[PDB]
């Protein structure tokens, strides 16, 4: 007649408490939901105790403490706030995930996707997809320090920090440019990595820099390694006259951390950006290395007048529908103001989101005239296909 088992805490429940316990009799002790068997400092999956003839149970009853879900999982480019008590990750504890605005935004489906609670199973879970944490997607356009639209005659072309947080600098075969897409992809021109006239053996080196406006600070910030190159098959190096398909994507080995000086740019959707008269900003680190970044505002013109000028200047010409010209002959500055293989940034006043409409492609005539770019809107599908790989 060993004594009746007595629960130490309140959550310990003895399964089928017999009125009396004799020799070779046993009792099993479980715990309520959200609580776990302990017994000392360790943890037990099950507890049973029996009588050793001398009225003594062979083992003492456990304690049944609360379950601890542990430290919440780290949200990439985000964090969490203790909705309940801080430091208490035990049962019935709620946290609120949040993303690093404005550079990142949480994926949607509102006080329902960022809230995660500690369940009785011992893990942080949410009502929709409990095991996995949310994901903070990068915000494409919306630069945090946009260029002033109140343009004046006295206007220095030197760009300030945060104006074009997507500009990149490449020193592959020469000084070239591009734009940042996401936190891992770089959109650039194809002829920047494949020489037109040189060709033949490639003095491979690459090197990609981004994050600042001064060249020396760009170099100091660090060299970003590339892991995959995707060139459009329409581009051909031997055809020095042609520049069709002058577009390429580079994949960084490690994703960058978006900040106020480093933000990507959205891709076009409707064609209203290529309408005549649209003012697009083209940035570049100047030629004849020149230090800081310099921008220039150019208007997109009628392709027919550009073709007339082309064939009137006894040029072979390689214009197509996937291209659009910009600038005006009355502009006394050189047609190479689209320095490097950068982008033709146009701001959409309907959504106030900057979008890359063209890529600096070919400009045969480093003196005066029009500039030529490649319509990004036509190659959007190929860009997305290469990105989803």
């Amino acid at each position: 007649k060993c004594p009746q088992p007595k629960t130490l805490d309140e959550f310990t429940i003895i399964q089928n408490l017999q009125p009396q316990y004799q020799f070779r009799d046993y009792f099993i002790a479980t715990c309520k939901q959200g609580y776990q068997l302990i017994e000392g400092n360790q943890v037990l999956h099950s507890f049973t105790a029996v009588c050793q003839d001398d009225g003594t149970w062979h083992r003492a009853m456990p304690r049944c403490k609360i379950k601890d879900c542990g430290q919440p999982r780290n949200l990439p480019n985000g964090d969490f706030r203790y909705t309940t008590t801080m430091g208490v990750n035990t049962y019935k504890a709620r946290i609120q995930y949040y993303c690093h605005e404005p550079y990142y935004k949480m994926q949607t489906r509102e006080s329902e996707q960022g809230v995660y609670t500690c369940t009785a199973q011992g893990i942080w879970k949410n009502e929709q997809k409990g095991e996995k944490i949310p994901r903070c997607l990068p915000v494409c356009g919306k630069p945090v320090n946009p260029v002033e639209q109140r343009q004046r005659i006295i206007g220095g072309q030197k760009a300030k920090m945060g104006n074009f947080p997507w500009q990149v600098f490449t020193n592959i075969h020469g000084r070239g440019g591009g734009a940042l897409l996401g936190d891992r992809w770089i959109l650039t021109a194809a002829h920047t990595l494949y020489p037109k006239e040189h060709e033949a053996q490639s003095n491979a080196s690459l090197d990609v820099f981004l994050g600042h406006t001064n060249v020396e600070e760009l170099m100091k910030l660090g060299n970003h390694p590339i892991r995959r190159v995707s060139v459009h098959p329409d581009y051909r190096q031997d055809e020095s006259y042609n520049f069709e398909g002058d577009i390429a994507l580079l994949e960084l080995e490690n994703s960058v951390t978006l900040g106020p000086n480093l933000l990507p740019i959205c891709l076009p959707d409707n064609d209203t950006f290529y309408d005549l008269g649209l003012m697009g900003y083209v940035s570049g680190f100047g030629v004849m290395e020149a230090h800081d970044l310099r921008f220039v505002r150019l208007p997109v013109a009628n392709p027919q007048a550009c073709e007339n000028w082309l064939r009137g200047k006894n040029r072979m010409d390689v214009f197509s529908q996937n291209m659009f010209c910009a600038g005006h002959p009355s502009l006394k500055q050189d047609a190479c103001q689209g320095d490097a293989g950068g982008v033709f940034a146009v701001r959409d006043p309907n959504t106030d989101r900057w979008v890359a409409t063209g890529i600096v492609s070919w400009g045969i005539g480093c003196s005066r005239g029009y500039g030529f770019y490649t319509k990004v809107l036509n190659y959007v599908d190929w860009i997305k296909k290469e990105m989803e790989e």
Partner: protein, 89 residues
Amino acid sequence: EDCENIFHDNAYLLKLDCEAGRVDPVEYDDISDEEIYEITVDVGVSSEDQEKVAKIIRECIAQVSTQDCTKFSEIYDCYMKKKICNYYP
């Protein structure tokens, strides 16, 4: 030489923006002394030449009274008569 070209190009771009109905010509005639100072220091003029540049700016905005798309074309002309680019590097 490059200063005159940059100013002429900015004037032509403002003329195009006026022809598109996005920048009203009368709104352009307003600018505070703080804005003039910040522009002069961002372009890189001497701290002493800022007074001459401000005088030139005020006088040139004054002399041009035609409220049309050619205003930006005429103001530029005035900036060349007062030789403002000599206060720039």
